[PDB]
């Protein structure tokens, strides 16, 4: 099928709060084809490596992939998701915002 | 991820009895890439009314796909089922054995 | 979880075209609790053969069931689905409408 | 169906680390009827109320549950989980082993 770009959407399971467990989730859907390269980073570096989702799945050629990491949010971190395709010619940097 | 050729399964849910409703089947199973060509045929012709299951992935992104249609088998016709992908030099073509 | 009353739904898979292969289905869905007896009736005559898909809930309890049979519609023959549960006083009989 | 009573497994989605964000699951398998009572305990007191997961699913009339939640592993701490069905004559308690 022919080439499409993901949506990036970055966002924790519960809302933030310092110091309290939680999942940051990046989800990348409506791509193709499969073939993505997708890292969370923390202050600009890439903390476990961590696989899709059983959730994930695939609808009309379309892919759909969750990728998540239990962390705890503190006062001066800064978490995002660097998602790279072949429909993007530089890797795409999507931040967290807590606020969201 | 690396190129991997298909297995093809063709099959009938139930065992055939000539002019008794049943569901041929065609499992194309642990390919890679996605990008898959699959057609059920009758004798010559196409058969032009075949559906799919959703395309299935593993976390080592191995592809698992179903086709399928309803048909009455009858002695005289012979089904089959032509896959073409990547990792075929020409489409390949899995004739259905009615005993296995 | 409370007792809630099953909604029944008869249809075949594809429109209705005598001498033409398809599928009976008889879906039960919004139900609780899961004990139910579902029958496939040609003429007021259970058929024997009857296949079910898997038992599907949601997050607030309530089942979603599947009953279905391959067949050959003919002009002659006519189509229910008898329905059995808690809920229910007496066996309640669907009839197969072609035309809904 | 017959009545069966569930299996019971607790466990830690990673190997524990005291002060290190965790999940702990507690997995009821195999059981009949679907009407059950489950809740994860820290020093004998239950946390947030926790639904099942959607990758819990039936197979042939048996139920098969996964519940889970965030939680940071401390050393005097200790959690288990308590399960209430038709099946048992009072609530099961399964503790959670670090090293299982
Ligand atoms: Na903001
Ligand atoms: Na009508």
Redo the contacts between chains.
């Keep these: 099928?022919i080439q499409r770009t993901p949506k990036i959407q970055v966002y924790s399971r519960?809302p933030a709060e310092n110091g309290?467990?939680?999942?940051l989730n990046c989800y990348v859907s409506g791509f193709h084809?499969?073939?993505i390269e997708v890292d969370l980073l923390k202050n600009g570096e890439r903390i476990e490596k961590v696989?899709?989702s059983?959730?994930?799945?695939?609808?009309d050629?379309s892919f759909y992939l969750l990728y998540y990491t239990?962390?705890?949010p503190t006062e001066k971190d800064e978490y995002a998701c660097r998602v790279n395709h072949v429909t993007l010619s530089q890797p795409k940097i999507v931040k967290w915002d807590r606020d969201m």
């Excluded at 309290?20 to 999942?23: D, E, M, P």
């Excluded at 059983?54 to 609808?59: C, H, Q, R, T």
Aim: glycine share 0%.
């Design positions: 099928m519960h309290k467990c939680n999942f084809p499969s073939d696989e899709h059983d959730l994930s799945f695939s609808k050629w239990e962390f705890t």
